[PDB]
């Protein structure tokens, strides 16, 4: 089973056995990291054909818009898998969420086999509100030296993130679900978030709801990452943006291994959260693992369990064991090229 909230509407393209998925290779190490995924996907016989599209922004009305070619493509196939892209008046990633109704960031950070970092047994899952909160565009100059940034928290927006969290926690068999907040000094704002979880709590009796102040969420996670290996934490935009980049710091010390999923109501985009790495581009040193794992997250979201587990449980996760494999970023000596074939072997 999978989460009711951002449900994929399947339908393989009747003419081919396959499902249609928009790519968005992106720029930089994007292209190489991308076809790396296309090959590994081919080999495992994934019911998927790629409809690559370009999100290079237009500027209808001074406000940055995203091209019709790519809109039609992505709204059609209810799913897309983007790599990293560069930096262009409105955040490219923002107008990407606004035009596709994406509202929830899902960020897992798990230790990698055969890559030693300072923190161990870190297996973390966090859902983040990506609509409102601290990150609504609302700020004012109330007078000369005085500014107001306005944090917006609504029940509607909160409800549907907290739901996906309960339902996602259920879909991956974690008992506990923690609402990170600060009702302490943000009584109304964070209080509403918390209450909305407490009220939803009841229609998900298989899961146990806990509430934690970021105070402790950050304290406890850094002292002992494993205390949340039955986690799924939900939180408003800011706490989420920080905790997730933190969790990654614990798991891998950077975020070249971190996959994200951006869930919308009927659409959903799955991306790697590292940059365009322009200086390593073309030289075949990139590390597909990041995007590759986002592929897995996508597979599961689509329903292709068997393939996802196949490409994750075996392959990559397992081929990242033996330094002859691996990439430069993990001490390894292998190329993007050799990593991909070395991966497909254990497919």
């Amino acid at each position: 089973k999978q989460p009711s909230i951002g449900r994929y509407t399947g339908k393989p393209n009747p003419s081919t056995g396959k499902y249609t998925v928009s790519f968005i290779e992106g720029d930089g190490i994007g292209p190489e990291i991308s076809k790396s995924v296309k090959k590994i996907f081919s080999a495992a016989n994934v019911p998927i054909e790629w409809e690559s599209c370009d999100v290079s922004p237009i500027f209808v009305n001074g406000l940055t818009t995203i091209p019709d070619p790519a809109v039609q493509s992505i709204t059609k196939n209810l799913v897309a898998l983007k790599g990293p892209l560069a930096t262009p008046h409105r955040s490219l990633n923002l107008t990407l969420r606004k035009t596709f109704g994406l509202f929830a960031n899902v960020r897992p950070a798990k230790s990698i086999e055969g890559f030693k970092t300072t923190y161990e047994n870190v297996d973390l899952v966090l859902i983040r509100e990506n609509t409102e909160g601290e990150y609504s565009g609302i700020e004012h100059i109330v007078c000369p030296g005085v500014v107001q940034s306005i944090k917006l928290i609504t029940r509607d927006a909160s409800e549907r993130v907290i739901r996906y969290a309960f339902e996602y926690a259920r879909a991956i068999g974690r008992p506990r679900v923690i609402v990170v907040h600060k009702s302490t000094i943000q009584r109304l704002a964070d209080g509403l978030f918390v209450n909305v979880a407490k009220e939803l709590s009841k229609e998900y009796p298989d899961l146990t709801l806990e509430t934690e102040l970021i105070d402790n969420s950050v304290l406890k996670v850094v002292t002992n990452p494993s205390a949340y290996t039955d986690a799924v934490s939900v939180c408003p935009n800011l706490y989420g943006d920080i905790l997730s980049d933190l969790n990654s710091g614990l798991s891998a010390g950077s975020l070249g291994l971190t996959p994200s999923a951006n869930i919308g109501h009927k659409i959903s985009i799955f991306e790697a959260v590292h940059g365009s790495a322009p200086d390593i581009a073309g030289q075949d040193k990139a590390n597909p693992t990041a995007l590759l794992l986002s592929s897995v997250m996508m597979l599961n979201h689509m329903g292709l369990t068997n393939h996802a587990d196949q490409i994750q449980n075996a392959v990559l996760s397992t081929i990242a064991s033996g330094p002859e494999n691996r990439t430069g970023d993990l001490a390894g000596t292998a190329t993007t090229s050799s990593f991909t074939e070395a991966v497909i072997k254990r497919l």
């Binding site: 007078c143 000369p144 030296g145 005085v146």
Partner: protein, 113 residues
């Protein structure tokens, strides 16, 4: 908060026009001040006189100067008798803590000294 709009401490000024306090005072005061008025409007200088006249309304001089911050005055007269009122030239200064007097003694070209 404060800094720009604040400035309730500079000299009274409204759209380019200062409002200065004028205290003609006793003796040739009244005439000698007038001389300045005339030279001022004849030069169309952007200042408007708030002008006051007065036994203990030395209060009103103070209160005015506290609004406008700046003033132009002659001298008042001071009694030598016992039941006389007391300088009130000094009263003005003490009550505004205008503690420093500067006098400029520079000889002038067309004057036999």
């Amino acid at each position: 908060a404060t800094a720009a709009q604040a400035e309730r401490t500079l000299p009274k000024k409204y759209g380019g026009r200062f409002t200065v306090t004028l205290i003609p005072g006793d003796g040739v005061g009244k005439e000698i001040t007038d001389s300045v008025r005339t030279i001022f409007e004849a030069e169309n200088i952007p200042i408007d006189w708030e002008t006051i006249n007065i036994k203990e309304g030395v209060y009103e001089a103070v209160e005015s100067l506290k609004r406008n911050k700046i003033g132009l005055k002659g001298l008042w007269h001071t009694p030598a008798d016992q039941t006389g009122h007391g300088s009130l030239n000094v009263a003005l200064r003490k009550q505004l803590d205008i503690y420093a007097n500067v006098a400029l003694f520079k000889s002038l070209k067309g004057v036999k000294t």
